[PDB]
Amino acid sequence: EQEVIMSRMPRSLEALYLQPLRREAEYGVPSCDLQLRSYSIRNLEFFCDFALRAAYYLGLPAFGPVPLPRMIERWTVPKSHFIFKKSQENFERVTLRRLIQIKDGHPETVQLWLAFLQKHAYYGIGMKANVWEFSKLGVSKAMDESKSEVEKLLETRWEHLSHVSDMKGVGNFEDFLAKERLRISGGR
Amino acid sequence: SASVIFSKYINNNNNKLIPFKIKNSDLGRTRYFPPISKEWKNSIYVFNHNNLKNLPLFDININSLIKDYFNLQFKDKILFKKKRLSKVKVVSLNKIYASKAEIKHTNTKAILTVYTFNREKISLYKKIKKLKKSFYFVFDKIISFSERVILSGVPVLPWITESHVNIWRKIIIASLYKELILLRKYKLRLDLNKYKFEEKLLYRLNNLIMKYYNKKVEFNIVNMRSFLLNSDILTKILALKLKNRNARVIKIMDVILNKANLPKINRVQEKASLIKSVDWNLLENKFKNLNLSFILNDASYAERNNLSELLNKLYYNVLLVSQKGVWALRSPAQPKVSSFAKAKKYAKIYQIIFNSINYKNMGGLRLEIKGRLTKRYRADRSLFKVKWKGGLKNLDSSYKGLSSVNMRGYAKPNVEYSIFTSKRRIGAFAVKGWVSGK
Amino acid sequence: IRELQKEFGTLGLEVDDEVDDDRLEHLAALRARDKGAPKKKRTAPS
Amino acid sequence: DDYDAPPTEEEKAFLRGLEQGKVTEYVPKLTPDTLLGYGPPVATDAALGKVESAMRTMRILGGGLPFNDQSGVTSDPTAIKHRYVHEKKPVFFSSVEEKEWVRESLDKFAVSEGPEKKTKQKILETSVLGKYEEPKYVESLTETVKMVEKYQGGTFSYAPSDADKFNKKLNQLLAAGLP
Amino acid sequence: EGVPVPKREDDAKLEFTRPYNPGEFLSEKLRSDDLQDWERERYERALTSWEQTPDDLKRGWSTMIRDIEQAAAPLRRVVMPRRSTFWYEEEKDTDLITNEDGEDDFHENDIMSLGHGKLEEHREFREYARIAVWEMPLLSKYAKPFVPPTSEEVLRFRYTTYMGEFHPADRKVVVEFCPKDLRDLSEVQQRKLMKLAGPRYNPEKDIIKMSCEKFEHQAQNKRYLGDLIEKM
Amino acid sequence: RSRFKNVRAVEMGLTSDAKIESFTKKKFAEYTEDEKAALAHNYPAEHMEAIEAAEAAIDPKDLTIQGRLRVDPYRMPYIDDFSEIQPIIDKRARRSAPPSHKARFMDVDEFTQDLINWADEIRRGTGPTDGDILSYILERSSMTDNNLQANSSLAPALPDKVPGVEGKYRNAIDPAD
Amino acid sequence: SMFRAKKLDLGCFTNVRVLRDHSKRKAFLEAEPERQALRYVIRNTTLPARTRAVAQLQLTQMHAYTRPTQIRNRCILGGKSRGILRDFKMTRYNFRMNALMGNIPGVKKASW
RNA sequence: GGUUCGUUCCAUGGAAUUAACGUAAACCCUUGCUUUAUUUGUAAAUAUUAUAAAGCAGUUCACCUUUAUAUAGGAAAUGAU
Ligand SMILES: [K+]
Ligand SMILES: [Mg+2]
Ligand SMILES: [Mg+2]
Ligand SMILES: [Mg+2]
Ligand SMILES: [Mg+2]
């Protein structure tokens, strides 16, 4: 046994004390438009960096964070619950938002990025991602062929859902999902 | 070839190149950005605001549910306490006081933060200790003594089955019944107080709160050492004390202030301003050109190009036995940890983390009581009392002149306001309370 | 609270409904000084 | 009569372990299987997007709760037994550990291993294969019934049950306004 | 019914009313009040063994339980509250009452509630610094390189995601293609496609953009646009 | 067409791509086989899998063309591997088993057997040491769950002398009073 | 009267008129597709004059609770209907107090 | 008794020394500049509108005048900015 004089620390730990590295896009065609939103700047600015670091490891060249126009709502209410209207005051809810656009990104790889961000989401931040993908003609035919490919991947995932034989509480399958999603989503 | 649709998004390349400019101006250190969860009780943003309108109403129900939860207590018949079934309304102060909950929302879960002042454990833990150590020592002798008399011959073996143990266990209970109940009472009351913060009972409260937000709720209960470090716990304790008709209002406030210790200060240095001078120790002013290529390129010192060497000269490293020394690793179930985790000393890190936090020391205290607090049961005029100790100002901005970050556009970041409403036999009264930090 | 007293009632734990307890104490104090509510009339006035 | 000695140093050092905590281990683990359930439910050609849209449909049948696989395995058994038996509706589990905790917390409670075959097809039918009912083109304007079906089939505001209530009253009026 | 009456018809009956020794306890138990005959023999065997021991060997036992009583003596002592008491002013539960000395001192081992929000915020930065150093690098093992779309991939669909949220707008699917990408259509056939497209055609960019949010699932909105483009 | 500027690259003398490589291999050289063995002997297998992947992903050419120092207010104020979970500065760990739903509070009969069982575990190494009696009042579960130590949601406590708070307060109460 | 549920299913501030307006929202949710068909037959000038008069007479016999114009937002905390904000379901005043104390996320006092 | 937008600051009093609130400071918007970011915004571009995070900036310097020599003030399109 001896002691080795380590020349440097692991690059994973060094990269944490550098600015988020960025890949280079050869073509520059957008593949994802992730828009984050919070009512507080601090949470948003932190997570925007945490997202760019994850995009570098996945080979996704990220561009941003682009500061989009902050959304400002306004209300003027009287300070009293009664006659005294000559005195009012203004309130607001400023929405601060950023944009991280990913260009020249593989469709599947871009989905792992969004999965990693949702699993490790920072509180107080809402996210919305638009995904683009190229596909050939004859969309209907492709969907049918994929069936067996998707079935094999769900073989081990069917365990999540379990119900009694001939579930009667559901009734009409489609009308259930349609109205269950309405209840889950608050009403719309 | 290539698609025409694919070639219609390449030409749209008018992006600006990153310049890597060199700073020629001095930069001051950034403000102290206070935590986010302290501006609004619900730190949330949702794209469908249907999940955002009912929160003000739920938090009234959640706080009503966490209060009744921390007050849970055994039924006097479970502990053999022989309740005195009196028609009185006993006011209990030796319980767990909880504050208003603060939730950190995400699309997957909700972290509920509540600050508690456990006053019941301070009493239970003291009395369970009063039991002399000889109890457990002498009790151990009865176990061995009872195994040589009942489960043996005359002056765990295969011929000693379990059915015989049942009768062997009742003889010990028959002779120590009045004592085994005493120890059981204090242990159960302690474990209950302990499980209220563990998953043994929280998983039941989660099922109740989970029906409001439709997400699994995680708890971050923070145990407070003193009840003066929180405005919610302070105004509630003082309110329970004042609910008695015979309560001396003016006297109960002085007893609380006398318990509030403030740090000694220098009135001249505390109120002294701060001159604005370039801090050349800041990493922004040290290396105006942040690029590694310029720095590590034998700028001033020789053969320090190693990036790790540069970082060690800027941050406090734990992996190094010596502060600026080299990193030495030993050359060639149990927990999976590094072979040097024990050598790591978080002595100065605790000094870096806790020095980066403002509003730690309590430096201000104000109490206001207003309403019908007279003794005689008649129609009298309202009463109002106010007591304070220290200041509620922001020293970093009012005197030093530094820039602060006000909460909700108007509130000071260092003060905690809370109001508690109660009622006497003659009317309603409120207890307001401010608590500032230095 | 009613669903909180039942979820934990199986463990032998009890809590008081202060909001409803004082309500009963108020109603009981009214009957003492002859101020409670009259007997609910369940038929037409005749 | 009463004098409790100060906390001994051996006692203090013990309380710190419970209050401050101890040096626990941490094992990194990240594979596409650990991220499945959090991905985007997009109808992309990539199978990862189709497998996620089927899980989202399973979560709507199970109650609609988010996919949380890192907040424990506890739940409300008395409420899951009612939904699973008395209401006869599906139940969605985030992990197998959460399924074996409901069994151990209920006396003689049996849950099926996955859904039935007929339920596996109905999930892939619309959520993956996207099989719809094409709204035909109605030329004449006097075809009231056919025109209503055309519009009802081109908007998700009219659920199958909301359309039935409409077509019921409509046919009741068209039949009551004839010779 | 009627005015509620109190509920005093409940109490916890103590099994034993006085300390019984092995001899007296077994004697009463062996009295055959309510006990199984096949179980009584287990008791008689114990009663005989107990009596067979040296008499004074019980003196040690009887004196053993007496010392445990003295060990638990200070645990049942009713402590009188301090004259000027704050926490036990009217505490009727004599169990919790104690000396009340030193329970209010500040040992300089806690910060205000405001300081805990900044401390918990650091425990979170370490949680993400732990993810960025140990879990992120594993993402590179499952990444795939980007490949440009071939000549056949002429459509460019768009799908919306809200990352765990349920929004009515996450069902719309937009598709945009270029009439000149379809090399099977001649000049006149391409110009007729720009006319049938109607307002969906952008003369400046020369792209036919069209969306669909008619159905409940994104899959159905994409299949309709896939069939519609085959009709166009 | 690249993404960054060359103004900061041509300043040091990296005009030639071949010269950029001399700046990487000289300063961002990959770990030596000797260091990998020593680095893999201290960290577990799961940790080394992330280090070997971080050096294959983060190419040294990027650290030279765009590698910049972090000066944002969200950077960590110290260096650390963040491999383990520390007592105070980290969130409390949750490595215990889930609680039993059928578990109930022990009674006089079950409590006695639990107490007897505890006297048999410590008596396997005289008599119960206060160190064990203290580990019985605060750790011994009084529920019918086979003595399960469940995960605690209580936040980690702070040091007995908080930096910035200690050395500023005086006890007003005296023993002579 | 007949639309009021025999078991209260309201968890907010209950009131005589809050309970009345909640029954009109449930009655309209069940009869909206039926009411939309009657309004479609009345405005369809291609149908016989008799079909339109029948639908026009049945739409008048519908209970008042079925009309959507009877619905009016109320304060979930106070139960008032004058001066309500759709974004918070509360009066202008209840919104002020809760916004100052921090119970309404994102809202702060505006100054500019 | 002077001075200051100001119980502001200085001097002084055969009685003062201090604390809290308001005031002040700080905060939000706005003005100039610096750094970061370049999409859904910008003709091009070696980057200059816009967008928005952080940081700096004033009565600061120069000139003139100046009580009790302690505190300072004036000048306002033709000093800098
Ligand atoms: K439909
Ligand atoms: Mg009367
Ligand atoms: Mg003076
Ligand atoms: Mg663009
Ligand atoms: Mg600008």
Side-chain angles (χ1 to χ4, degrees), chain F residues 75-86:
Chain F
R75 65 187 213 278
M76 210 61 61
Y78 54 80
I79 292 166
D80 185 4
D81 62 351
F82 308 98
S83 47
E84 64 276 324
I85 295 167
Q86 297 298 343

Side-chain angles (χ1 to χ4, degrees), chain C residues 34-38:
Chain C
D34 269 39
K35 302 291 184 186

